[PDB]
Structure formats: C-alpha cells, structure tokens
C-alpha cells in the first residue's frame, strides 16, 4: 500500500506538472524576477553579477524558443540562439551583423528579444480571445508598461538599473502567464 500510494503520488505530481512547468519555474522577490532561481536585472542596492543576468537570459531564451518550438510558431524576424552564458540573436533577414544579450552593443539584442516576445504574444493571442498580458510592450520604443500606468525601458543605456530591473520582472511576469497558457493547452491532452 505504501509503494502503491507513493507511485500514485508520483503520477499526480507528474500530471500536475507539464514538461514546461518542470523545466522552467518562474517567480519573483521584490523587484527581482527569477527564472529557475536566476535573477533577471539587478537592484541598485545589490551588486548582482552580469554573469547571473547572462545565465538568466540563457534560460529565458530557451524558454521562449521552446514555447514557440512546441506551439509550432516560427519566428518572422529573429532566430533565438540560446547559450547558457552568451545568448544572442541572429536575424532571419540580416545575418551580416548581430548583437548579443549577454553583458560583462547589447541594446539592439534586448529589443530584438522583445520582438520575439511580441511575435509569440501575437500567436498566443490568436489562440483564445480570453488571453491577455498584464504588461504592455512597445518594441518600437523598447519599453514595458504596467496597467494595474507606469512606463519603463528595457534599454539600459541612458537609464538606470532600478527602472530597468522592474521592466525585466514585468516582462518575465508576462512570460509566466504565457507559459501557463501553453501548459493549459497540453497538460490534459
């Protein structure tokens, strides 16, 4: 009975956790957003290493890539190149130049990432009319804005890390709801 009840417990925890929810977990702590316990962005009061931010991107890039790859979505403007420490993007229309998401350039990569998020969002919104995202995105400006009316920039140049880290948390919070939607369409099938 103990062995049977244990196996039953394993079955229940697997059914409650789709492959994506098992591979990636998303939460937050203050202004920090975290994927797989890697903080994205840094508080001005904390000397967070760029290495951690690079690792957090390596997860976020794989997450957004894999979500599209499972859903069958093919990107229209950029190809995500996931690296655990040096993620970057390759444009489908321009492979002569590139800009990486890792730091130690930079700014065109961050907006190009939001471009992938926008393309993903459009495909998810083409799903069910009931899906929305709590934070707005303007890839043309490179900004993220809250609704529940503040505005912040994902471009870190000519800005400060406090306004930037919040925007990263906001963006990750959107990906949270995106992942939940993807899982809601495959966890029971």
């Amino acid at each position: 009975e103990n062995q049977m009840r244990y196996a039953q417990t394993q079955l229940d925890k697997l059914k409650k956790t789709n492959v994506f929810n098992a591979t990636f977990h998303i939460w937050h702590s203050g202004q920090f957003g975290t994927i797989n316990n890697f903080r994205l962005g840094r508080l001005p009061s904390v000397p967070v290493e760029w290495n951690e931010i690079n690792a957090a991107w390596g997860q976020t890039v794989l997450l957004l890539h894999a979500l599209a790859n499972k859903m069958g979505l093919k990107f229209q403007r950029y190809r995500l190149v996931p690296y655990g420490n040096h993620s970057y993007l390759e444009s489908l229309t321009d492979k002569s130049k590139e800009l990486p998401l890792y730091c130690s350039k930079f700014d065109h990569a961050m907006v190009a990432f939001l471009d992938c998020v926008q393309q993903f969002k459009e495909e998810v919104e083409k799903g069910e009319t009931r899906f929305c995202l709590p934070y707005r995105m303007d890839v043309e400006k490179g900004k993220i804005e809250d609704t529940g009316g503040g505005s912040y920039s994902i471009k870190t140049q000519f800005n400060s890390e406090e306004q930037w880290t919040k925007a990263l948390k906001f963006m990750l919070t959107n990906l949270k709801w995106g992942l939940a939607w993807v899982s809601s369409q495959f966890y029971n099938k």
């Binding site: 103990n2 062995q3 244990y6 977990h25 998303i26 939460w27 702590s29 797989n36 316990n37």
Partner: protein
C-alpha cells in the same frame, strides 16, 4: 511512519526528525516523551526530491 526520530533521553525537547527537512510538518508517573504535530504558493527555489524513505523502514 518512515520518519527517523532522534530522541534525546536527557533533553527530550531537543528530539527531532532526522529523515526530513522543515518541508515536513514539524513536531501515570511514567516519564513519557510525547510528540505533538504543530498546527501549521511562492516558489522560493525548486522543490527538492524527498530524501527519506517511501516505505516502511525495517532497521536502523
């Protein structure tokens, strides 16, 4: 119950469950040590694997 208990016969208030972290619910003229379970979401890191046994422990 597959929970290893360390019992301190000199200071029983210091007795504790060895086969588990704090994820588990914490706890006639005869000196009886009584264990009463305490009357006790944010993903503060991933959930670890249960390290303890999952079936009746037979010996120590």
């Amino acid at each position: 119950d597959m929970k290893i208990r360390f019992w301190d016969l000199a200071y029983p208030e210091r007795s504790y469950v060895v086969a588990g972290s704090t994820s588990s619910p914490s706890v006639e003229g005869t000196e009886v040590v009584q264990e009463i379970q305490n009357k006790q979401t944010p993903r503060r890191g991933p959930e670890s694997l249960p390290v303890g046994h999952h079936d009746i422990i037979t010996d120590v």
